[PDB]
Amino acid sequence: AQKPVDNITQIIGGTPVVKLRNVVDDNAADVYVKLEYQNPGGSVKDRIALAMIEKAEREGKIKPGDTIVEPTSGNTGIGLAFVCAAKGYKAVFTMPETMSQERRNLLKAYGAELVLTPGSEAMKGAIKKAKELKEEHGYFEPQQFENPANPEVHELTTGPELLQQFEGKTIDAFLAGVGTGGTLSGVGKVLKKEYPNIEIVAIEPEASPVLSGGEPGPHKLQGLGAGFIPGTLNTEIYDSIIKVGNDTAMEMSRRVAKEEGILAGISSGAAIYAAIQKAKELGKGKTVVTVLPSNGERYLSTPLYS
């Protein structure tokens, strides 16, 4: 049990790793899974929310009481709202009016202000409104898709944690779904430095396989498939790309929940599906690691568990 801290953000990081024992064949490599949903805010985005805020503090760009704006309808909104409440910043999020009342109440419960943009404009209108508040009113925009603090925090916390957790062993393959790409790039840089023969595998939805030179599209793998190549993604870090479909990811999340007791989001089901295929390719004696970015409870209102 960790000794008491004075701020909830001091709990971010240090997430556990669980070996999969049922859904992976015995004739395959070991599959280990890092529970980023054990972060206090509920997802991997806890790390980059705190890092982007504390980097701007360090650089003198913001001070407690300042207002932060970010166009997000996913876990970065929850992570930023959580961190801003904990550190004393005013969080503002732009999002289409379409968003669910549950997610809106969650962000408002942290005291965040919501700027609701036209639902017909979707993410474009939300990004537009954030730019107006940034440019015309001086709101600080973390910009999770360009801010180097995103992949760098994975260089300085997530990656090193995996080194410390797999000391005495070698990691033969790391896989991660790509949303901002900060996870894959930051930990991939650190693991490749320590394990020069590791395979770094990008996971992306088969509906929007942009990284595989493919063509953008709509998917249900929340947290992935931004439709572009983010500045925070190091496109050289990965040696290969595994594409996962919506139904395959949902079926794997349900199996992991029923057979491993690990209830995680659809993107986690995609990561585990890819990690199992890679583990079957490597065979016994090899070690395959992937990341579970979010919990399944956050999606009990989705067809994933309906």
């Binding site: 876990n75 289409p96 992935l224």
Partner: peptide
């Protein structure tokens, strides 16, 4: 539309 994405959720990140």
């Amino acid at each position: 539309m994405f959720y990140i």
